[PDB]
């Protein structure tokens, strides 16, 4: 079999790797290609801070809940391992803040040592009245992409820097199975109106002492529009911007100020911090992760599609569970092509 994986981002490569390993033995000519328009230092997966944390409420798909959990376990089972450094993986604890009470999550047991905030801690953040504290994981995308690649290279997966214009284009030229892991730009390959870019702008600042992450939440501002502070590895991440259908990949001076003024008030130790950089990204926002098969129709023979897009603000967080599901379905494509 010949396999083509469009998309060289976290979703795309995790899959390519996870499809390889699993069916490397039970398939003679398993030849995986990756096509993509922007590689590892230039994707939406790079803009992400990579903090493990799914939506605050149940998604339409509870098949999703298990997925983010699946990633977390795999990740934590490799935090205290040599690779972890190359992976951009490590533990990180922090505050989740609200303006009022609110039910627990779902990942409640998934995350490590989940517990409610205490009065005495709340004091440190005047503007808020209720919140949480727990231990999670950060999977930095720049080290993850880099690692996944080297992993995929030794496996023999080749990479090509081409903008696919159509599944047919690839089918018609030899593709047996096509994995669409093309995120927020999946639209151009197949009109999807439920897939919108929730615009993200962030700030990378040098403030080492920051050791705890601080996501806040206010209903009037909106999902990921409430300020957050995620100390990464070599720098700490300011951010808190969410804007649907704003395909504007460019830093906004007015956003800058709402991130700055916003996070400062949260932790004024920040005011005399240092701005290393400012970046913009698009959360592939969609009601529920598109993870399913499709039957594209051509000249002679029909070719399968495995769609893997729309993870929005929780890409890194749910990546594996999905990349490991997509492989699941890929084995179903083989049983059907009768091979075994």
Radius of gyration, alpha carbons of the chain = 20
- Segment interacting with its own copies, rule: CB under 8 A, options 7-15, 115-123, 181-189, 292-300: 115-123
Nearer to ligand FAD, 122 or 293 (CB): 293
CB count within 10 Å of CB 263 equals 25
Per rule CB under 6 A, is residue 116 in the interface with ligand FAD? Answer: no
Which token pair is 296?
């594209």
Choose among its own copies, ligand FAD, none what residue 268 binds, the Cβ cut-off being 5 to 8 Å by kind.
its own copies
Residue 31 labelled as part of a binding site: no
Please select the residue that binds its own copies; options are 81, 161, 257, 298, rule is CB under 8 A: 81
Tell me which residue of 189, 216, 211 sits closest to 127, measured CA to CA: 216
φ and ψ at residue 164, rounded to 5 degrees: -60, 135
Q: Count the neighbouring beta carbons within 10 Å of the beta carbon of residue 20.
A: 19
Torsion sign over Cα 250, 16, 230, 194: positive
When asked if residue 189 is in the footprint of ligand FAD (CB under 6 A), the reply is: yes
Going from the C-alpha of 91 to that of each of 41, 52, 140, 147, 250, the distances in angstroms are 23, 10, 12, 18, 31
- Strands (DSSP E) contained in the chain are 2-6, 31-35, 89-98, 112-116, 130-139, 158-160, 177-180, 196-206, 213-217, 228-231, 236-239, 274-285, 290-296, 303-309
Q: Please identify which residue in the block is written with the tokens 């396999």.
A: 3
Q: Is 37 in the site for ligand FAD (CB under 6 A)?
A: yes
Window of 39-47, 52-60, 87-95, 252-260 that interacts with its own copies by CB under 8 A? 87-95
Residue 196 binds ligand FAD, judged by CB under 6 A: no
39 token code pair: 């590689």
183 binds ligand FAD (CB under 6 A): yes
Q: Please identify, among the stretches 126-134, 245-253, 286-294, 310-318, the one whose residues bind ligand FAD according to the rule CB under 6 A.
A: 310-318
Least separation in angstroms between residue 208's CB and its own copies is 5
User: What is the Cα 124 distance to its own chain's centre?
Assistant: 30
User: Looking at 170, 316, 324, 326, which residue binds ligand FAD (CB under 6 A)?
Assistant: 316
Q: Within a 10 A sphere around the Cβ of 165, how many other Cβ atoms?
A: 10
Interface region with ligand FAD, contact rule CB under 6 A, candidates 80-88, 97-105, 108-116, 282-290: 282-290
Choosing from 72, 147, 185, 260, the residue that interacts with ligand FAD (CB under 6 A) is 185
| Interface residues toward ligand FAD, by CB under 6 A | 6-12, 35-38, 43-45, 47-51, 163-164, 182-185, 188-189, 200, 202, 239, 281-284, 309, 311-317
| Interface residues toward its own copies, by CB under 8 A | 76, 79-82, 84-85, 89-93, 112-113, 115, 117-118, 120-121, 124-125, 133, 135, 207-212, 231, 233-234, 267-269, 271-272
Binding-site annotation: residue ranges for D-dopa: 53, 283, 313
């Amino acid at each position: 079999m010949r396999v083509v994986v469009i998309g060289a981002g976290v979703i795309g490569l995790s899959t390519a790797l996870c499809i390889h390993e699993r069916y490397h033995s039970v398939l003679q000519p398993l030849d995986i290609k990756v096509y993509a328009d922007r590689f590892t230092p230039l994707t939406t997966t790079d803009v992400a801070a990579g903090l493990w944390q799914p939506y605050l409420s149940d998604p339409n798909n509870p098949q999703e809940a298990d997925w983010s959990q699946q990633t977390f376990d795999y990740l934590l089972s490799h935090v205290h391992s040599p690779n972890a450094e190359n992976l951009g993986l490590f533990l990180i604890s922090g505050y989740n803040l609200f303006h009022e009470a609110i039910p627990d999550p779902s990942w409640k047991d998934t995350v490590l040592g989940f517990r409610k905030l205490t009065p005495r801690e709340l004091d440190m953040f005047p503007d808020y009245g209720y919140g949480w504290f727990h231990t999670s994981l950060i999977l930095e995308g720049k080290n993850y992409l880099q690692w996944l690649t080297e992993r995929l290279t030794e496996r023999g997966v080749k990479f090509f820097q081409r903008k696919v214009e159509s599944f047919e284009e690839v089918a018609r030229e030899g593709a047996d199975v096509i994995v669409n892991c093309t995120g927020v730009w999946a639209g151009a390959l197949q009109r999807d109106p439920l897939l919108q870019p929730g615009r993200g702008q962030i700030m990378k600042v040098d403030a080492p002492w920051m050791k705890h992450f601080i996501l806040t939440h206010d209903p009037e501002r909106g999902i990921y529009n409430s300020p957050y502070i995620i100390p990464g590895t070599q720098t700490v991440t300011l951010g808190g911007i969410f804007q649907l259908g704003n395909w504007s990949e460019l830093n906004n001076i007015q956003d800058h100020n709402t991130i700055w003024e916003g996070c400062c008030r949260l932790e004024p130790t920040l005011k005399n911090a240092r701005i290393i950089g400012e970046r913009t990204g698009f959360r592939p926002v969609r009601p529920q992760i598109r993870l399913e098969r499709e039957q594209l129709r051509t000249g002679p023979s029909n070719t399968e599609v495995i769609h893997n897009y729309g993870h929005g603000g929780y890409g890194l967080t749910i990546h594996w569970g999905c990349a490991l599901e997509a492989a699941k379905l890929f084995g179903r494509i083989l049983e059907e092509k009768k091979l075994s």
